[PDB]
Amino acid sequence: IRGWIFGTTLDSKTQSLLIVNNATNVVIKVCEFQFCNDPFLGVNCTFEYVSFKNLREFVFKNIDGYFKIYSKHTPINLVRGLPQGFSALEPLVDLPIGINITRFQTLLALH
Amino acid sequence: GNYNYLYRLFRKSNLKPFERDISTEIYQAGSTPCNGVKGFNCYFPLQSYG
Numbered sequence: 741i742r743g744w745i746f747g748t749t750l751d752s753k754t755q756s757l758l759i760v761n762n763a764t765n766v767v768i769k770v771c772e773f774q775f776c777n778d779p780f781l782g783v784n785c786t787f788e789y790v791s792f793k794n795l796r797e798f799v800f801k802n803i804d805g806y807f808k809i810y811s812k813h814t815p816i817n818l819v820r821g822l823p824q825g826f827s828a829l830e831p832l833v834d835l836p837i838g839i840n841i842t843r844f845q846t847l848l849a850l851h
Numbered sequence: 852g853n854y855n856y857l858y859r860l861f862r863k864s865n866l867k868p869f870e871r872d873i874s875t876e877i878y879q880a881g882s883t884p885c886n887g888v889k890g891f892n893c894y895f896p897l898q899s900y901g
C-alpha cells in the first residue's frame with residue numbers, strides 16, 4: 741500500500757484528493773486528476789503539500805472542508821489478521837481542501 | 852464591462868461550510884437532459900457580473 745484517492749466522480753470533472761507515500765517524501769494534491777481505470781505504481785490544481793510483525797492504522801475524516809488524519813504504528817504478534825487488544829491513534833495532519841469527498845480507493849505498488 | 856469576474860447561479864445541492872466547487876458541468880433544470888449542450892431547461896451554471 742503506497743497511497744489513496746478520495747473524491748466524487750474520479751474523472752477530472754472535479755478537484756480530487758491524491759495522497760502518495762514514497763521513500764523520498766510523502767505528498768498530497770487536490771488537482772482535477774484524470775485517474776486511470778486501474779491505478780498502481782510499477783517500481784487545474786489548487787493545493788499541494790509535502791513531508792507481519794507490524795500493523796499501520798489510520799483514520800481519515802473530512803469536516804467543514806478540513807481533511808483530518810490520525811495514525812498509529814504498532815508491533816503485533818497475532819499474524820492471522822486484524823488483532824484484539826487496544827491502542828489509540830493520534831493526529832498527524834489537518835488539511836484545508838474544501839472537496840465534497842464521497843468515494844475513495846487505495847493505491848498499490850508492484851515490483 | 853469586466854466579464855472576468857464570475858459566480859455560480861445554479862447548483863442542485865447547497866455547499867456545506869467551506870465546501871468548494873469549480874465544476875462547470877451544464878445544469879439540467881428540468882425533465883430534459885443536457886448531454887453537454889445548452890438549451891431548453893439546460894443552463895450554464897456560472898454567470899458574469901460584467
Ligand SMILES: *[C@@H]1O[C@H](CO)[C@@H](O)[C@H](O)[C@H]1NC(C)=O
Pocket residue numbers: 748840842843863864865866867
Ligand atoms: C457531494 O457529492 C455527492 C455525489 O457523490 C452529491 O450527491 C452531493 O449533492 C454533493 N454535494 C453535497 C452538498 O453533498
